Design a protein around this ligand. Structure first.
Ligand code: NAG
Ligand code: ZN
Lengths: 598, 195
């Protein structure tokens, strides 16, 4: 009579027609709230959001009535499998409401936690902007200490009892979905099981993330050693030339990024980095021109122009009206080919660079807009930010800034400026890879049951010393949940995307620059005015989720799996500089030493 | 003096849905096409079979104007040999099509803030439409072998879906008033020829 492949296709057509309208209303309502913060808009967003959320769960329940194995079309199966993801629905009504109570309790604790200064009693500060300012700008050992310890004593201890129940429920939810644990559930974002020759496994993610981590260690060892040697000048005591790096002394509260250690550890402090902010204001640049020049960047490489609705509807600058807007830079794919960007665009170099980043998201959204509704995403959770990140790589290079007249025609690039630029990139890119790897390795084993609840903080601080070279300033006695102090752990967010995206980022850039016939160091590459590079990237962008990420990655970089040699090639001039600067320094760390040992 | 009511067709205050498109027989009048091809308001004037030139030497018994509103992305489907929801389920042009397809964005007219759902398109049908065939049937569509008994359940879908038309949608998902001029000739005396 009729195959089950036809029934799901008809079901998807009915779903797509109503998903498009209901999601757009949810997206439009969320856009109105984000561009106009009023109490009425919150109710309108929630009612529109709940209606779409209720509709999706109803369709997901109906989607599970179709056998997934009885499908031969790859495109159809990817849509149904995405729709058949039951999630927390498989839990009992008693546990499902308990889980959401736990998740909301942790988010409220994280967003309302306040660490208090021991010296000044009524000096309790929230993480943002209170504790973030202390952990990003202060150079006092004690000031960074109480802020670091206060955030984990006050907030981490309030999340430890919740996280233990969180782990048990999320594992029960995952085991109901026929997953080994909740960590295995998260690794399913990278799993590909139906495209022969490009299949990827959830277990294979661990074996591939570990392989890339063993290759970045020598680069990280010298970066760790050079930072440690420079930090010895700032912190003569409380540090060891052969030991680890104290956790509070890093760039931020958790040590996720070392970007805030650039002033303390800059290679050549007398020669400043390239800053075109002054020239832009002297050339009469406004927010319109920043996005116009950003648009010219994508036109040069062959990507399509911004739509007319983009200019009419986007909030490219903070309104002069009294309406309140939270303007964290975001690119919006509302639906119905409605692409918008909301940003408090100032005339600065950073806003110029993130304009290319956010428009890189929009260019990705425009490319897979022809994909079905359920296949309009990046190839995996790390592809969408990788595409945006490589747009800022080309825009920030002096070669690009000279073409658009932001640098003098006779401007000469210095060798001590490339070192300063590469070092500032290693603080953000390379300084985060051990941190991201360690955190997801910890949660994967905690979910797997390899770390008993009496050893959560015992193995957290023995892996933070062995893999990251980072040692706790103060001991913890299992009544803490230090990982839960991070946003992505308390708020149920997978963290491995920040690792794979970094690998994908420079993998894309290395391949695009070779197509662009770039000669010289990779960090000097600019893919501008190279239609060949832009079209090759556009091939993967148009795929969306129609193809597995292993197939999408191969179409740009020519490699099916993650490769970190492109990342090592990007920092090779710095790595050569680092190894020469570490001739008279000890490279590596010993786990035995701790700041509190003596 | 006696001009054809093309204004009443193109400047009609409201167009019909694509599944229930309105057909008008323009005859017993003199048609002025100068304001059509020389006007920049029309984003699409793809004419098939005949061209605007060499037009005064042809006699057609009657003129049929099929007016309906569809999405911008579906304007490409109003053409012979096209495939899609509109081509197969809502409005099918014959392969031997002799006429001009006129489309123009009507975002200002046919789109409202919050959505304009007065335009419906047949999302599901048991078979593809014949050329120029109009189907206004509104019975529950059966996907599987389970009977629906007049109520939509599982594998039971209402065949008509409503266009969501907001002014902020992308140009692809925007209302486009399409007027299809069909010229028919028969053994009639063909009183209306055009000097
Ligand atoms: C519709 O109205 C406009 C202006 O009112 C006019 O220019 C146009 O010719 C009219 N359409 C027809 C088919 O006459
Ligand atoms: Zn981003």
């Amino acid at each position: 009579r009729s195959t089950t492949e036809d029934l799901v296709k008809t079901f998807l057509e009915k779903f797509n027609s109503e998903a498009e309208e209901l999601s757009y209303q949810s997206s439009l309502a969320s856009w109105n709230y984000n561009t106009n913060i009023t109490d009425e808009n919150v109710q309108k967003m929630n009612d529109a959001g709940a209606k779409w959320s209720a509709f999706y769960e109803e369709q997901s329940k109906q989607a599970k009535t179709y056998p997934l194995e009885e499908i031969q079309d790859s495109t159809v199966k990817r849509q149904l499998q995405a729709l058949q993801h039951s999630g927390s629905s498989v839990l009992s009504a008693d546990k499902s409401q308990r889980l959401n109570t736990i998740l909301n309790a942790m988010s409220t604790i994280y967003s309302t936690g306040k660490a208090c200064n021991p010296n000044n009693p009524q000096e309790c500060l929230l993480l943002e902007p209170g504790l973030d300012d202390i952990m990003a700008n202060s150079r006092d050992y004690n000031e960074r200490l109480w802020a670091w310890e206060g955030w984990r004593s006050e907030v981490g201890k309030q999340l430890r009892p919740l996280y233990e129940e969180y782990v048990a429920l999320k594992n029960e939810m995952a085991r109901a979905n026929n997953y080994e644990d909740y960590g295995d559930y998260w690794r399913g974002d990278y799993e590909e099981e139906w495209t022969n020759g490009y299949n990827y496994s959830r277990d294979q993610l661990i074996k591939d993330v570990e392989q890339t981590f063993t290759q970045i260690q020598p680069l990280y060892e010298h970066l760790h050693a050079y930072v440690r040697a420079k930090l010895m000048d700032t912190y003569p005591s409380h540090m060891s030339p052969t030991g680890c790096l104290p956790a509070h002394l890093l760039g931020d509260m958790w040590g996720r990024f070392w970007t805030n250690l650039y002033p303390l550890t800059v290679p050549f402090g007398q020669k400043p980095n390239i800053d075109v902010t002054d020239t832009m204001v002297n050339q009469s640049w406004d927010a319109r021109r920043i996005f116009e020049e950003a648009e010219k960047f994508f036109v040069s490489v062959g990507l399509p122009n911004m739509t007319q609705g983009f200019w009419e509807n986007s909030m490219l600058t903070e309104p002069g009206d009294s309406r309140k807007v939270v303007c964290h830079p975001t690119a919006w794919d509302l639906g119905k080919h409605d692409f918008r960007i909301k940003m408090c665009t100032k005339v600065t170099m950073d806003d110029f660079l993130t304009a290319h980043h956010e428009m890189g998201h929009i260019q990705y959204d425009m490319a897979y807009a022809a994909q079905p509704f359920l296949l309009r995403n990046g190839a995996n959770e790390g592809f969408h930010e990788a595409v945006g990140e490589i747009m800022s790589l080309s825009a920030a290079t002096p070669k690009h800034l000279k073409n658009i007249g932001l640098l003098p025609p006779g401007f000469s690039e210095d060798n001590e400026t490339d070192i300063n630029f590469l070092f500032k990139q290693a603080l953000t890119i390379v300084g985060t890879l051990p941190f991201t790897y360690m955190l997801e390795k910890w949660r994967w084993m905690v979910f797997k049951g390899e770390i008993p609840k009496e050893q959560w903080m015992k193995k957290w601080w023995e892996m933070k010393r062995d893999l990251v070279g980072v040692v706790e300033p103060l001991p913890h006695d299992e009544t803490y949940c230090d990982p839960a102090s991070l946003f992505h752990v308390a708020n149920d967010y997978s963290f491995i995307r920040y690792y794979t995206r970094t690998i994908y980022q420079f993998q894309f850039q290395e391949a695009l620059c070779q197509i662009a016939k770039h000669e010289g160091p990779l960090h000097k590459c600019d893919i501008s005015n190279s239609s060949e590079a832009g079209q090759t990237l556009l091939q993967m962008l148009k795929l969306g989720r129609s193809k597995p990420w292993t197939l999408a990655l191969y179409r740009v970089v020519g490699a099916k799996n993650m490769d970190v040699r492109p990342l090592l090639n990007y920092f090779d001039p710095l790595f050569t500089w680092l190894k020469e600067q570490n001739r008279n320094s000890f490279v590596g760390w010993n786990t035995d030493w701790s700041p509190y040992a003596d | 003096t006696n001009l054809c009511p093309f204004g009443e067709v193109f400047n009609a205050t409201r167009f019909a849905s694509v599944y229930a498109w309105n057909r008008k027989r323009i005859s017993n009048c003199v048609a002025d096409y100068s304001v059509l091809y020389n006007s920049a308001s029309f984003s699409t004037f793809k004419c098939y079979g005949v061209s605007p030139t060499k037009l005064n030497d042809l006699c057609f018994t009657n003129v049929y104007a099929d007016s309906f509103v569809i999405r911008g992305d579906e304007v490409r489907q109003i053409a012979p040999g096209q495939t899609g929801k509109i081509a197969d389920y809502n409005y099918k042009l014959p392969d031997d099509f002799t006429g001009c397809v006129i489309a123009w964005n009507s975002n200002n007219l046919d789109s409202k803030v919050g959505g304009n759902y007065n335009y419906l398109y047949r999302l599901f049908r048991k078979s593809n439409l014949k050329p120029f065939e109009r189907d206004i049937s509104t019975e529950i569509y059966q996907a599987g072998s389970t009977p629906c008994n007049g109520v939509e359940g599982f594998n039971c879908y209402f065949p008509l879906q409503s266009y969501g038309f907001q002014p902020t949608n992308g140009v692809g998902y925007q209302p486009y008033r399409v007027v299809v001029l069909s010229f028919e000739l028969l053994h009639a005396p063909a009183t209306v020829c055009g000097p």
